[model samples]
Target: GRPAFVSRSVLVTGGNRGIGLAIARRLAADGHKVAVTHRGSGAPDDLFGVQCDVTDSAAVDRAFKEVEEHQGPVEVLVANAGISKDAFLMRMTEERFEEVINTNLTGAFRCAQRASRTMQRKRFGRIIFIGSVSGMWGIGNQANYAAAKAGLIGMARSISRELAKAGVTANVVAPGYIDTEMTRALDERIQAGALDFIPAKRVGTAEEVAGAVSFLASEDASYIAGAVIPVDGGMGMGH
Candidate 1:
C-alpha cells in the first residue's frame, strides 16, 4: 500500500508481456507514470508505449526521448529486454553467441548508460535488471544465455559503485522457472527435472518476480545496491 516514490517516470523495456509487463503493472498500481517499450506497435492503452529495439542504439535513444518528453526523465528503469539462444559449446555458432550477449548484456548496458544520465543529474534513480537462474548454474545448452545473464551481475555491481555517490542504485533480479509460456513450452519431464533442483518444488510466477523487482526499486531499497535478489523459490540459494 505504500508508494515508495512519488509519480515518478518509470520505463520498463520489453514490457508488453510476460514478466516485464507484470513489473510495469505493479509499478503502475503504485501511481507512477509507467511506460513500456515494444518493437512493432505500442503497448495497450493502459500503459504508455515507446517503440524500441535494444540492439539498436538509435532506437534506444529514440525511445528514451519519447519517454522523457511524455513522462519526464526516466527515474526508474527496468532493463528487462533480453533474448536467449540455446546451443552447446561445439554446436554454438559465433553468431548465436554474439546475438544473445549483444542483446542481453550489451543491451542492458546501453539502456543503463542512457538512464543514468538523468538519474545522476537528478540525484536519485533506480536501475533494476531482470536476470535468470540459468546465469548461475552451468545449465546444458544455454551457455550463451548463462554468460549473458552472469555478466549482468558484474555490470550491475560496477554500475552501482559508480553511481552510489549520486544517489543511484543498480541491482539485478534473477528468476528461475517462472510460470510463463516459455517454461510451459518445455516438456513435462523437463519441468519435473527443474523442480528437482528447486527446493520449493514448484514453478514461480511473473508477478512474484515482479514483487522482488518492485522492492529493489522502492525507497527502502536505496541502500541495497549491487545486490542480486533471486526470485527463484530458493532454487539458486543466492548463487
Candidate 2:
C-alpha cells in the first residue's frame, strides 16, 4: 500500500470558531467532504454546517445522520466541542462540575460512540479528541475543566484498544496556550503569567494545533493510536 485519500466524510464538532474551525478548514483543504456542527454560532462559508449541541445525544445523532446522507458514512470524527467553568474548589458548585463533565467528557463520549458505529461497520475510522495541557498539568480554579479534559485521555485510550483490531484509531491532541478567542479574553496578568512559563515565550496559533489534528486524521497516522500529542511549545513536559 499506498496512502490515498480514501476517506471522504468527516464531522467536526464546534467547528464554527476557534481550534475546531481550524481543524475543519484543514481537513476540507485536504479534499475531504467536511461537515461541521455548531450549537448557536453560524459556520464559515467554506464548509457545510449542521446545527447541533454535543451535549444532546439526539441532536448529535441527527447531525451524524445528516452528514451521512450528504457525504457518506463518517470516516473521521474530531471531537472538539468542550466547555469550561473555572472556579476554585472552595467556590465551585456541584452544578458547575456536572455541567463541564456533561459537555466535555460525556459529549465526547456520545460523538465518538456514534461515529464508531459507522467506522466499525466499515472497519475503518479516525477519532481525534481535542484536549488541553491544563488537563495534564492541572490549572488552579479550573478543576472541572481539568477533570473533563483529563477524562478525554482515558476515553481515547480505551477506544483505541477496543477499535484497533477493527481498523479504527483514537488519539488526543493537548494544546497549550493557543491564541484563540477564549485565551484572548483572559486577564492580562494571567496571560502574561502563562507566557512566562512557555519556553517559546509566545502563544501558539490555531493553525499549529490544526496541523497536528490534520496529521492525526490522515492515513499517515495509521500507527499512532492511543497517543497524546502535545502542541504546547514545550510548556508541560515530563508529565
Candidate 3:
C-alpha cells in the first residue's frame, strides 16, 4: 500500500510573486505547512507571510525564527528569491554587479546557513535552490545573474556533500524561458530569439517549475542530491 502524505514545514523565499509564489502554493497544496518571505508585499491569502530582505542577514534569521514559531521548523527550504540587473560587462557597474550577487547568491547562502541548523538537528531536510538556464549556458548582458545562478550549483553540491550524513539533501531546479512576468516583460525580439534555441518552441509555465520542486520535496526524491533539474523544455538539454 502507498504511504500516506507526511506534511512538513516549508519556507519559500520571495514567495509573494512569480516562481516563489508558485512553489509556495504548490507545496501548501501538497499538504505541507508553507511560509513565504517577501520584502514588503504580503504573501497570498492563505499562506503565512514573513517580511524579509534576503540581503540582510538579520532579517533572514528573524524570518526563519518566525516561521519556526508559526508552523514549526522548516523541513523544506526553497531559496528562490532573486533579482537580475542586466548590462554588458563594461557597462555594468561594481554596485550593480554586487547588488545582484548579494541578492541572488549571497542571499541564498544566508538562508541556507540558517536553515541548516534546524535541518541538521532534525536529521531531515531538503534544500532546493531555484536556479536558471542562464547559469548553465550563460547569457549576454547578465554576467551578474549568470554568476549568481551558477554559484548555486556549486553551493548545492557542497551542502549536499557536507550534510548528507545528517539526512539533508540540496539540489538546484533551473528553469528556462518560463512564462513569468519577468520573461513576458523581456524585449519582443529577445523572446522570439529564445524560441529558436528551445526545441519545444514555447515557454514553460510556473506550474511546470512547481512540479519539479514538488518532486524534489517529496519522499520519492530521497536519494537525489546535488543535481540540477532543468524545467526548460529542452532549451538547456546539452548542458
Candidate 4:
C-alpha cells in the first residue's frame, strides 16, 4: 500500500526557469512548501525565491537559511541548477571545463551537504540530482557537461550509502532530449538529427521530468536509493 502523503519543505536550485521551474511548480502543486534559488531574476508569483548563485558557497548557505525560515528545514532537495558550455574536446578550454564542473558538480555538493545537516538530525531527507543521459553516453561537444553530470551519479550513490541508515536517500534523475529552451535553441537540422536516435521519436516535456522528481520525493520511493531513474525516451538505453 502507498504511504499517506506528507507535506515537506522542498528546495529546487535554479528553479526560476526551464526544467527547474517545471520541477518547482509541480512540487508546489503537490502541496509541498517550495522555495527556489536564483541568481537575480527573482521568483515566480507563486513560489518563494531566494537570490543566490550556486557557485558560491556563502551564497548557497544564505539561500538555504532564507528557505529554512520561509518554509522549514529542507526535507526534499532537488539539485537541478546546471549550465551547459558546449565545445568540442579539442576546443574546450581549461577555464570552460573548470567553470562547468565548479557550478554543476561542486555546486550540488555544497547545497547537498548543507541540506544533509537538518535531514540527518531529523532522520528524513530526499536528495535528488538532475543528471543527464549525456553523462552516461558521452555527448559530442559537451565534454564539460557530460563530465559534471557523470560526477553527480558518483556523488549520489556515495551519499545514498552513507546516509541510508539515517533514513536519508539520494538519487539521480537523468533526462535526455527534453523540450527546453536549450534544446529548441539548437539548429533545426540538429534537432531533426536528435529525433532520429530517440526511440520515442519525439522530445520530452519538462513536466515529464518533473513527474519523475515527484515520484522520487514521495514515500513510494523511500527504498529507491543510489538509483538513476532515466526520464529519457530510451535515448541511451543498454548503458
Question: Which regions of candidate 2 deviate over 4 angstroms?
Answer: 182-192
lDDT of 3: 0.91
List the pairs of residues colliding in candidate 1. none
C-alpha RMSD between model 3 and the true structure: 1.3
**lDDT (Cα, 0-100) at 63 in candidate 2:** 89
Would you list the clashing residue pairs of candidate 3? Answer: none
lDDT of 4 by residue, 1-239 (tens): 76789999999999999899999999999988999988899997589999988888999999999999899999999999989888879999999999999999999999999999999999999999999989998878889999999999999999999999999999999998777745544547355587776799877899999999999998789899999999889987876
Instruction: List model 2 lDDT by residue over 1-239, tens digit each.
Output: 85877556889999989989988998899888899999877788678888988888999999899888888888989999988788889999999999999999999999999998889999999999999988898867889999999899999999999899999999999998887835444547455576776788877889999999889888789888999999989887866
The CA root-mean-square deviation of candidate 1, after full C-alpha superposition on the true structure, stands at 1.8
lDDT ranking from best candidate downward: 4, 3, 2, 1
- Lowest summed lDDT window (length 10), candidate 4: 181-190
Model 1 per-residue lDDT tens digits across residues 1-239? 75446677899999988889898998898777899998876695589999998999999988999999998999999999998778769999999999999999999999999998899999998989999887887567988999999999999999988888999988999998887635433446455576788889887999998889778767768788988888887888743
What lDDT does candidate 4 reach at residue 37?
A: 89
**Which whole-number lDDT from 0 to 100 does residue 61 have in model 1?**
88
Candidate 3, position 223, lDDT: 90
TM-score of predicted model 4?
0.97
Higher-ranked by TM-score: 1 or 2: 2
**Model 4 ranges off by over 4 Å:** 183-192
TM-score list, all predictions? 0.94, 0.95, 0.96, 0.97
